[PDB]
């Protein structure tokens, strides 16, 4: 009944070392601790993924390359472009150990769910959904979401993956493109030039997986009410058509107002309504993080969502803690949306929803 929280001090220190999000893991954990939420959870130490575990998805050649460049942090290896290492995914010293740690944490959370230790297991430092079997991408070196789904598959016949990160969950969608046993649903910004460039509403998967990929392309400036209306509409239809046995939910906070990417205009309350809708299904649920580049806001978001999972109302005042001085200028838990336009036209959203409904008739 009590949610599992994947945590150890060593794991947070490892996750803190990614240069695209330095110290973020510590900020998220410190805020959760400051609100005393960890006392309401079952704290489980993550295992480190073995080569065999990582190889359930990633190719041997890619894993061996990552291991090789990780030794000295060789960021100029002849084969690195081929393997997606470069500006977004640099070959830093020890990056293999980092990858193995996050892969292992999501696998540990999935195992907790299989064993019935909990109905909800949380790995806020996971969710690296862009990585491909043989290629790093989008700050992701190992696709822990795919590894977690593959572990859950041992017990759960149909798994629903829901991806609320700002960016299209392309690595997870591609991994499961050809199967009807895992349905992927991504809501994301979709615009020419915007990473990774995929995920139009017409992208529905392939072969036996046709219609078991769902993409909801959204324009800039979306706020809580409209986002929740879209998310609820799609998830209601998906749940009815697909009848999942377990859910993996990626909650990247790069949609939240104040993110330097400045694309969506969401608050944690809106994402929380989506989370509540999914929790009401009462299925085994693996909760992951993902993007989020305003570090204090990402901690605000994931702390608030941890409160949602626990059914608790948190104080609006950020408690004093290690990183309190980073919570200005308001020092409150709530995030105020920016005063910019929502570029989502109601007719286009209607069209997208109609198209998705038509696709889901084939799953039914």
């Amino acid at each position: 009944l009590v949610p599992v929280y994947i945590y150890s001090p060593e794991y947070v220190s490892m996750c803190d070392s990614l240069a695209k999000i330095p110290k973020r893991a510590s900020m998220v954990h410190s805020l959760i601790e400051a609100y005393a939420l960890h006392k309401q959870m079952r704290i489980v130490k993550p295992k480190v993924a073995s080569m065999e575990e990582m190889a359930t998805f990633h190719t041997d050649a890619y894993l061996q390359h990552l291991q090789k460049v990780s030794q000295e942090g060789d960021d100029d290896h002849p084969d690195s472009i081929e393997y997606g290492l470069g500006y977004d995914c640099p070959a830093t010293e020890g990056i293999f150990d980092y990858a193995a740690a996050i892969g292992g944490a999501t696998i540990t959370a999935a195992q907790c769910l299989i064993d019935g230790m909990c109905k909800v297991a949380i790995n806020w430092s996971g969710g690296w959904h862009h990585a491909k079997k043989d290629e790093a991408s989008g700050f992701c070196y190992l696709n822990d979401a795919v590894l977690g789904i593959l572990r859950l598959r041992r017990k759960f016949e149909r798994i629903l993956y829901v991806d609320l990160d700002l960016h299209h969950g392309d690595g997870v969608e591609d991994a499961f493109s050809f199967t009807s046993k895992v349905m992927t649903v991504s809501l994301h910004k979709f615009s020419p030039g915007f990473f990774p460039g995929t995920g139009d509403v017409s992208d529905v998967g392939l072969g036996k997986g046709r219609y078991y990929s769902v993409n909801v392309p959204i324009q800039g400036g979306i706020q809580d009410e409209k986002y929740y209306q879209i998310c609820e509409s799609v998830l209601k239809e998906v749940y009815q058509a697909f009848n999942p046995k377990a859910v993996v939910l990626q909650l990247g906070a790069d949609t939240i107002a104040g993110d330097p990417m400045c694309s969506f205009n969401m608050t944690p309350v809106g994402i929380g309504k989506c989370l509540k809708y999914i929790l009401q299904w009462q299925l085994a649920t693996l909760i992951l993080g993902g993007g989020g580049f305003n570090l204090a806001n990402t901690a605000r978001c994931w702390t608030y969502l941890t409160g949602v999972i626990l059914g608790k109302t948190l104080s609006s005042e950020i408690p004093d803690h290690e990183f309190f001085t980073a919570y200005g200028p308001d020092y409150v838990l709530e995030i105020t949306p920016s005063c910019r336009p929502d570029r989502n036209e109601p007719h286009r959203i209607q069209q997208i929803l109609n198209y998705i409904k038509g696709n889901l008739k084939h799953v039914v």
Binding site: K20, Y87, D88, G138, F139, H167, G193, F194, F195, P196
Partner: peptide, 5 residues
């Protein structure tokens, strides 16, 4: 290939 970032 797009850049993220």
């Amino acid at each position: 290939r797009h850049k993220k970032x």
